[PDB]
PDB file of C-alpha atoms in Angstrom:
ATOM      1  CA  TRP P 245       0.000   0.000   0.000  1.00 56.10           C
ATOM      2  CA  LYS P 246       2.875   2.489  -0.443  1.00 55.30           C
ATOM      3  CA  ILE P 247       2.026   5.349  -2.819  1.00 55.98           C
ATOM      4  CA  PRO P 248       4.773   6.637  -5.130  1.00 52.35           C
ATOM      5  CA  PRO P 249       5.119  10.419  -5.252  1.00 52.00           C
ATOM      6  CA  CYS P 250       4.154  12.360  -8.338  1.00 50.54           C
ATOM      7  CA  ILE P 251       6.683  14.267 -10.348  1.00 47.87           C
ATOM      8  CA  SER P 252       4.715  16.189 -12.956  1.00 48.82           C
ATOM      9  CA  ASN P 253       5.968  17.621 -16.219  1.00 51.45           C
ATOM     10  CA  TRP P 254       3.769  20.723 -15.843  1.00 52.38           C
ATOM     11  CA  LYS P 255       3.835  21.685 -12.144  1.00 49.02           C
ATOM     12  CA  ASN P 256       7.022  22.255 -10.140  1.00 50.87           C
ATOM     13  CA  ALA P 257       5.394  24.272  -7.352  1.00 51.23           C
ATOM     14  CA  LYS P 258       8.434  24.342  -5.067  1.00 51.51           C
ATOM     15  CA  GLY P 259      11.166  24.400  -7.713  1.00 52.45           C
ATOM     16  CA  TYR P 260      12.935  21.093  -7.090  1.00 55.22           C
ATOM     17  CA  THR P 261      15.637  19.437  -9.176  1.00 56.88           C
ATOM     18  CA  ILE P 262      14.939  15.876 -10.271  1.00 58.38           C
ATOM     19  CA  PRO P 263      17.432  13.906 -12.385  1.00 59.04           C
ATOM     20  CA  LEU P 264      16.510  13.348 -16.015  1.00 58.24           C
ATOM     21  CA  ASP P 265      15.967   9.612 -15.497  1.00 60.15           C
ATOM     22  CA  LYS P 266      13.386   9.854 -12.714  1.00 61.49           C
ATOM     23  CA  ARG P 267      11.862  12.869 -14.441  1.00 60.58           C
ATOM     24  CA  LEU P 268      11.343  10.692 -17.507  1.00 59.79           C
ATOM     25  CA  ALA P 269       9.676   7.541 -16.154  1.00 61.28           C
ATOM     26  CA  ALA P 270       6.344   7.896 -14.326  1.00 62.26           C
ATOM     27  CA  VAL P 278       5.887   0.512 -32.005  1.00 62.59           C
ATOM     28  CA  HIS P 279       3.922  -1.867 -34.222  1.00 64.80           C
ATOM     29  CA  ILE P 280       4.341  -2.305 -37.959  1.00 66.56           C
ATOM     30  CA  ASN P 281       2.052  -4.541 -39.962  1.00 66.00           C
ATOM     31  CA  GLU P 282       3.380  -7.163 -42.350  1.00 66.51           C
ATOM     32  CA  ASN P 283       1.365  -5.990 -45.343  1.00 64.97           C
ATOM     33  CA  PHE P 284       3.650  -3.034 -45.890  1.00 66.27           C
ATOM     34  CA  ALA P 285       6.112  -5.479 -47.388  1.00 67.93           C
ATOM     35  CA  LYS P 286       3.625  -6.955 -49.814  1.00 72.61           C
ATOM     36  CA  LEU P 287       2.449  -3.521 -50.925  1.00 71.62           C
ATOM     37  CA  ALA P 288       5.911  -2.033 -51.425  1.00 71.88           C
ATOM     38  CA  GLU P 289       7.259  -5.021 -53.264  1.00 69.72           C
ATOM     39  CA  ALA P 290       4.218  -5.287 -55.518  1.00 67.96           C
ATOM     40  CA  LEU P 291       4.870  -1.677 -56.433  1.00 65.80           C
ATOM     41  CA  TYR P 292       8.524  -2.262 -57.277  1.00 67.88           C
ATOM     42  CA  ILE P 293       7.664  -5.241 -59.464  1.00 70.29           C
TER      43      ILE P 293
ATOM     44  CA  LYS U 114      23.866 -19.054  32.418  1.00 73.25           C
ATOM     45  CA  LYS U 115      21.203 -17.626  30.107  1.00 73.59           C
ATOM     46  CA  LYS U 116      20.773 -16.725  26.442  1.00 71.12           C
ATOM     47  CA  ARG U 117      18.149 -15.229  24.121  1.00 76.00           C
ATOM     48  CA  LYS U 118      17.833 -12.945  21.113  1.00 79.50           C
ATOM     49  CA  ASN U 119      15.155 -10.711  19.647  1.00 82.19           C
ATOM     50  CA  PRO U 120      15.449  -9.406  16.070  1.00 81.94           C
ATOM     51  CA  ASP U 121      13.839  -6.234  14.735  1.00 83.10           C
ATOM     52  CA  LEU U 122      11.298  -6.352  11.907  1.00 85.64           C
ATOM     53  CA  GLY U 123       8.868  -4.072  10.113  1.00 89.23           C
ATOM     54  CA  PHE U 124       7.101  -1.511  12.324  1.00 89.03           C
ATOM     55  CA  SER U 125       3.993  -3.275  11.087  1.00 90.88           C
ATOM     56  CA  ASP U 126       1.590  -1.415  13.376  1.00 88.88           C
ATOM     57  CA  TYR U 127       2.414   1.159  16.032  1.00 89.16           C
ATOM     58  CA  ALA U 128       0.973  -1.486  18.353  1.00 88.57           C
ATOM     59  CA  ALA U 129       3.826  -3.894  17.610  1.00 89.77           C
ATOM     60  CA  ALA U 130       6.556  -1.434  18.571  1.00 89.39           C
ATOM     61  CA  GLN U 131       4.598  -0.290  21.616  1.00 83.70           C
ATOM     62  CA  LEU U 132       4.276  -3.923  22.671  1.00 81.09           C
ATOM     63  CA  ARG U 133       7.986  -4.611  22.267  1.00 85.15           C
ATOM     64  CA  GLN U 134       8.766  -1.583  24.401  1.00 86.57           C
ATOM     65  CA  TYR U 135       6.314  -2.719  27.050  1.00 85.71           C
ATOM     66  CA  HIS U 136       7.958  -6.128  27.115  1.00 86.46           C
ATOM     67  CA  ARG U 137      11.336  -4.597  27.815  1.00 86.64           C
ATOM     68  CA  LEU U 138      10.062  -2.236  30.507  1.00 86.95           C
ATOM     69  CA  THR U 139       8.039  -4.971  32.189  1.00 84.32           C
ATOM     70  CA  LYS U 140      11.008  -7.336  32.296  1.00 84.33           C
ATOM     71  CA  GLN U 141      13.042  -4.595  33.964  1.00 84.15           C
ATOM     72  CA  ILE U 142      10.820  -3.977  36.973  1.00 85.11           C
ATOM     73  CA  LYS U 143      11.587  -5.727  40.261  1.00 87.25           C
ATOM     74  CA  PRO U 144       8.901  -5.690  42.974  1.00 89.26           C
ATOM     75  CA  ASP U 145       9.319  -5.733  46.740  1.00 91.39           C
ATOM     76  CA  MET U 146       7.308  -8.504  48.370  1.00 88.31           C
ATOM     77  CA  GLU U 147       7.925  -6.678  51.638  1.00 90.17           C
ATOM     78  CA  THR U 148       5.742  -3.715  50.734  1.00 90.08           C
ATOM     79  CA  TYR U 149       3.316  -6.104  49.059  1.00 90.94           C
ATOM     80  CA  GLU U 150       2.757  -8.082  52.254  1.00 92.82           C
ATOM     81  CA  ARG U 151       2.627  -4.876  54.293  1.00 90.41           C
ATOM     82  CA  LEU U 152      -0.115  -3.496  52.044  1.00 88.43           C
ATOM     83  CA  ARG U 153      -1.705  -6.942  52.164  1.00 88.08           C
ATOM     84  CA  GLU U 154      -2.100  -7.396  55.895  1.00 86.14           C
ATOM     85  CA  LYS U 155      -3.917  -4.072  56.106  1.00 85.70           C
ATOM     86  CA  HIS U 156      -6.546  -4.598  53.424  1.00 89.09           C
ATOM     87  CA  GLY U 157      -6.846  -8.361  52.911  1.00 90.90           C
ATOM     88  CA  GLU U 158      -9.874  -9.359  50.870  1.00 87.59           C
ATOM     89  CA  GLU U 159      -9.957  -5.957  49.151  1.00 87.01           C
ATOM     90  CA  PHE U 160      -6.770  -7.094  47.376  1.00 86.71           C
ATOM     91  CA  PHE U 161      -8.592  -9.300  44.916  1.00 83.96           C
ATOM     92  CA  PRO U 162     -11.269  -7.157  43.231  1.00 82.85           C
ATOM     93  CA  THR U 163     -13.150  -8.097  40.129  1.00 81.50           C
ATOM     94  CA  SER U 164     -13.789  -5.402  37.551  1.00 81.68           C
ATOM     95  CA  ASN U 165     -17.025  -4.683  39.395  1.00 83.54           C
ATOM     96  CA  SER U 166     -16.536  -6.160  42.850  1.00 82.41           C
ATOM     97  CA  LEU U 167     -14.828  -3.960  45.408  1.00 82.88           C
ATOM     98  CA  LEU U 168     -14.021  -0.320  46.090  1.00 81.46           C
ATOM     99  CA  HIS U 169     -11.809   1.808  48.288  1.00 82.58           C
ATOM    100  CA  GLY U 170     -11.775   5.484  47.452  1.00 84.35           C
ATOM    101  CA  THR U 171      -8.177   6.283  46.617  1.00 82.57           C
ATOM    102  CA  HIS U 172      -4.715   4.900  47.337  1.00 85.00           C
ATOM    103  CA  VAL U 173      -2.472   7.859  48.147  1.00 86.56           C
ATOM    104  CA  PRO U 174       1.187   7.377  47.209  1.00 84.77           C
ATOM    105  CA  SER U 175       4.296   8.332  49.148  1.00 85.19           C
ATOM    106  CA  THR U 176       6.179  10.864  47.064  1.00 84.89           C
ATOM    107  CA  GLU U 177       9.297   8.698  46.921  1.00 88.92           C
ATOM    108  CA  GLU U 178       7.223   6.272  44.861  1.00 89.78           C
ATOM    109  CA  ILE U 179       6.075   9.002  42.487  1.00 90.66           C
ATOM    110  CA  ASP U 180       9.724   9.723  41.821  1.00 91.26           C
ATOM    111  CA  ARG U 181      10.183   6.212  40.454  1.00 93.46           C
ATOM    112  CA  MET U 182       7.569   6.641  37.741  1.00 99.09           C
ATOM    113  CA  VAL U 183       8.831  10.146  36.952  1.00100.81           C
ATOM    114  CA  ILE U 184      12.348   8.818  36.431  1.00101.68           C
ATOM    115  CA  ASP U 185      11.112   6.018  34.194  1.00 98.92           C
ATOM    116  CA  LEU U 186       9.154   8.644  32.272  1.00101.03           C
ATOM    117  CA  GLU U 187      12.282  10.643  31.568  1.00100.35           C
ATOM    118  CA  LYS U 188      14.145   7.493  30.527  1.00 98.99           C
ATOM    119  CA  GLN U 189      11.495   6.341  28.061  1.00101.95           C
ATOM    120  CA  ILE U 190      11.198   9.880  26.735  1.00103.98           C
ATOM    121  CA  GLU U 191      14.915   9.970  25.917  1.00103.83           C
ATOM    122  CA  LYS U 192      14.884   6.504  24.365  1.00 99.87           C
ATOM    123  CA  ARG U 193      11.969   7.624  22.193  1.00 98.79           C
ATOM    124  CA  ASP U 194      13.739  10.864  21.274  1.00 98.56           C
ATOM    125  CA  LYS U 195      16.366   8.692  19.598  1.00104.08           C
ATOM    126  CA  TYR U 196      13.761   7.011  17.305  1.00100.42           C
ATOM    127  CA  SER U 197      15.170   8.250  13.993  1.00100.03           C
ATOM    128  CA  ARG U 198      18.895   7.745  13.493  1.00100.08           C
ATOM    129  CA  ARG U 199      20.163  10.548  11.277  1.00 97.28           C
ATOM    130  CA  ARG U 200      22.702   9.862   8.545  1.00 95.04           C
ATOM    131  CA  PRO U 201      25.759  12.190   8.819  1.00 93.03           C
ATOM    132  CA  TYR U 202      25.965  15.224   6.436  1.00 94.33           C
ATOM    133  CA  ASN U 203      27.955  13.535   3.647  1.00 94.59           C
ATOM    134  CA  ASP U 204      28.926  15.982   0.866  1.00 94.59           C
ATOM    135  CA  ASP U 205      31.110  13.314  -0.827  1.00 95.87           C
ATOM    136  CA  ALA U 206      28.419  12.291  -3.424  1.00 95.96           C
ATOM    137  CA  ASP U 207      27.067  14.480  -6.313  1.00 97.91           C
ATOM    138  CA  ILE U 208      24.656  17.348  -5.385  1.00 96.01           C
ATOM    139  CA  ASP U 209      21.633  17.812  -7.677  1.00 98.97           C
ATOM    140  CA  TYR U 210      19.204  19.195  -4.997  1.00100.23           C
ATOM    141  CA  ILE U 211      18.764  22.946  -4.240  1.00 96.98           C
ATOM    142  CA  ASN U 212      17.746  22.664  -0.484  1.00 94.98           C
ATOM    143  CA  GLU U 213      17.261  19.977   2.235  1.00 92.85           C
ATOM    144  CA  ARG U 214      13.558  19.545   1.378  1.00 91.05           C
ATOM    145  CA  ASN U 215      14.634  18.940  -2.256  1.00 88.90           C
ATOM    146  CA  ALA U 216      17.451  16.635  -1.136  1.00 88.69           C
ATOM    147  CA  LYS U 217      14.960  14.459   0.834  1.00 89.76           C
ATOM    148  CA  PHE U 218      12.410  14.468  -2.019  1.00 87.16           C
ATOM    149  CA  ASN U 219      15.158  13.243  -4.379  1.00 87.83           C
ATOM    150  CA  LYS U 220      15.986  10.453  -1.822  1.00 85.69           C
ATOM    151  CA  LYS U 221      12.296   9.309  -1.657  1.00 84.26           C
ATOM    152  CA  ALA U 222      12.219   9.319  -5.495  1.00 80.17           C
ATOM    153  CA  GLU U 223      15.407   7.132  -5.446  1.00 79.91           C
ATOM    154  CA  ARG U 224      13.529   4.517  -3.381  1.00 78.48           C
ATOM    155  CA  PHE U 225      10.517   4.364  -5.716  1.00 77.61           C
ATOM    156  CA  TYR U 226      12.101   4.498  -9.292  1.00 72.96           C
ATOM    157  CA  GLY U 227      14.818   1.844  -9.850  1.00 70.07           C
TER     158      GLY U 227
ATOM    159  CA  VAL R 179      42.418  40.402 -26.735  1.00 70.75           C
ATOM    160  CA  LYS R 180      40.440  37.190 -27.254  1.00 70.58           C
ATOM    161  CA  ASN R 181      42.018  33.791 -27.939  1.00 72.83           C
ATOM    162  CA  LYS R 182      39.581  31.110 -29.085  1.00 72.12           C
ATOM    163  CA  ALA R 183      41.144  27.725 -28.292  1.00 73.22           C
ATOM    164  CA  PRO R 184      39.824  24.446 -26.811  1.00 76.17           C
ATOM    165  CA  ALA R 185      39.459  24.720 -23.048  1.00 76.22           C
ATOM    166  CA  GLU R 186      40.927  22.300 -20.545  1.00 75.85           C
ATOM    167  CA  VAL R 187      38.309  20.508 -18.463  1.00 78.59           C
ATOM    168  CA  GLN R 188      34.649  21.584 -19.209  1.00 73.47           C
ATOM    169  CA  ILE R 189      31.604  23.376 -17.707  1.00 73.12           C
ATOM    170  CA  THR R 190      29.398  20.271 -17.339  1.00 72.33           C
ATOM    171  CA  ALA R 191      25.987  20.607 -15.661  1.00 73.69           C
ATOM    172  CA  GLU R 192      26.612  19.060 -12.229  1.00 72.00           C
ATOM    173  CA  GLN R 193      29.027  21.928 -11.739  1.00 69.69           C
ATOM    174  CA  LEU R 194      26.230  24.425 -12.293  1.00 71.56           C
ATOM    175  CA  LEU R 195      23.989  22.477  -9.938  1.00 69.71           C
ATOM    176  CA  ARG R 196      26.676  22.246  -7.239  1.00 69.58           C
ATOM    177  CA  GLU R 197      27.564  25.941  -7.521  1.00 67.49           C
ATOM    178  CA  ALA R 198      23.896  27.011  -7.264  1.00 69.28           C
ATOM    179  CA  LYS R 199      23.560  24.616  -4.269  1.00 67.69           C
ATOM    180  CA  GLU R 200      26.562  26.401  -2.657  1.00 65.92           C
ATOM    181  CA  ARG R 201      25.115  29.832  -3.528  1.00 68.67           C
ATOM    182  CA  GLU R 202      22.750  29.252  -0.573  1.00 68.98           C
ATOM    183  CA  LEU R 203      20.873  32.133  -2.127  1.00 73.47           C
ATOM    184  CA  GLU R 204      18.544  33.068   0.747  1.00 73.86           C
ATOM    185  CA  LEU R 205      18.474  30.269   3.276  1.00 76.72           C
ATOM    186  CA  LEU R 206      18.206  32.767   6.080  1.00 80.46           C
ATOM    187  CA  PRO R 207      20.443  33.999   8.914  1.00 80.57           C
ATOM    188  CA  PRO R 208      18.881  32.813  12.167  1.00 81.28           C
ATOM    189  CA  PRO R 209      16.574  35.101  14.137  1.00 78.11           C
ATOM    190  CA  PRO R 210      18.938  36.707  16.648  1.00 75.95           C
ATOM    191  CA  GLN R 211      18.816  35.438  20.205  1.00 72.45           C
ATOM    192  CA  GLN R 212      18.475  38.250  22.710  1.00 69.38           C
TER     193      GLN R 212
END
């Protein structure tokens, strides 16, 4: 039941430094692209 | 000769720590059967009251007694004062924080984002 | 006169953060005991 704290990307009410890594953390391609592109080359 | 050990664990509830402390304090005390028998021969059957059974208005304590509990109070108060052990001001590592509130917030963030 | 030529160590960020940390800008001097 421990709740992580929030570090927002919009609000920094108290002006605190947070390292880039912890600041940071808080793609598909079909297989028919191949058939289309190669049909076009042919 | 005697031997035992007791390891520390999670604070799970304030009740657990309170209970541990009571255990220690209880084990410490040593009672005088002299005063017990003295108090006994005066009052007799009044000694063994149920929750609801018997009643005598108030037991008035000699001051010397009161000093015992006061001393134990001061002792437990000190021992409690030492609850949080502070980590010495170590400047050796890299400083990214701007103030001690920010330094502690960065430390809490270190625990939750690995 | 200006001489443009590659510096020695660098001015990496942690240095800015540590110097601002040691600028202590307005912590505050303590309220005087009297």
